[PDB]
RNA sequence: GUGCUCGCUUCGGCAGCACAUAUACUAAAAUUGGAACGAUACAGAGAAGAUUAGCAUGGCCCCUGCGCAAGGAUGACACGCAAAUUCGUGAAGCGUU
């Protein structure tokens, strides 16, 4: 179940962070260029220095577009059958009756049987 | 401007001294814009059938009123394809390591 906005974030982060692959060439290049400060503390100096080249920002933009697509596929539309006896006259009435069947559907299980058998019992 | 000068010294002038010491949104204007109902056509008053009392609520909406009264159509407006972070099952067919 859902239970939190942070647990779905954590699941989504584990997915993205397992999908990524690091490049050791760029890593060792920047390590050899930066030297002493490549293992920084909270307070070293480099906060206002990095300028990423075009390939890095292109990779970030493509990854973020894929992430936006994965987010937009979150609520899949359930298929609409017209064989069920419809009990709504609007477009919002159908979804409100669906919410009523979600919440009160466990309790109001005898009266629907009474209705379908002819208002008896 | 006025007065006093044992001022020249006449009643003409001049000299000295004293008192008196800074108005005006500066126009009888040139300009510059936003504005008077109200007439012109249109336009028609909320609450799930119809006929209807209303009291609110919110603010780059005001009017009448001295009003922290009360009115203005319940003063008007508000009416919205009301979507905010973040997904997974199972088999089935096809291609692939
Ligand atoms: Mg009123
Ligand atoms: Mg009325
Ligand atoms: Mg009102």
Q: What's the CA-to-centroid distance between A109 and ligand 3, angstroms?
A: 46
Distance in Å from B6's C1' to A40's CA comes to 110
CB A94 within 8 A of CB A101: no
Rounded Cα gap, residues A15 and A21, in angstroms = 12
DSSP label of A45: S
Query: Which of A95, A104, A101 is CA-nearest to residue A77?
Result: A95
Method of determination is: cryo-EM
Distance in Å from B28's C1' to A87's CA comes to 86
Q: Indicate the helix (H) or strand (E) that contains A93.
A: helix A92-103
Query: Which of A56, A63, A61, A52 is CA-nearest to residue A17?
Result: A63
Residues 23-52 of A with CB under 7 A from strand B: none
Resolution (A): 2.9
Q: What's the CA-to-centroid distance between A114 and ligand 3, angstroms?
A: 48
Q: Which nucleotides of B are covered by protein (CB under 7 A)?
A: 81-83, 85-88
Nearest nt (C1') from A67 Cα: B86
């Amino acid at each position: 179940g859902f239970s939190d906005y942070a647990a779905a974030q954590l699941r989504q982060y584990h997915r993205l962070t397992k999908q990524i692959k690091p490049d050791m060439e760029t890593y060792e290049r920047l390590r050899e260029k930066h030297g002493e400060e490549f293992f920084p503390t909270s307070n070293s100096l480099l906060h206002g220095t990095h300028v990423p080249s075009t390939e890095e920002i292109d990779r970030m933009v493509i990854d973020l577009e894929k992430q936006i697509e994965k987010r937009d596929k979150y609520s899949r539309r359930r298929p609409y059958n017209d064989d069920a006896d419809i009990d709504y006259i609007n477009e919002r009435n159908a979804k409100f009756n669906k919410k009523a069947e979600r919440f009160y559907g466990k309790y109001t299980a005898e009266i629907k049987q009474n209705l379908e058998r002819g208002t008896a019992v």
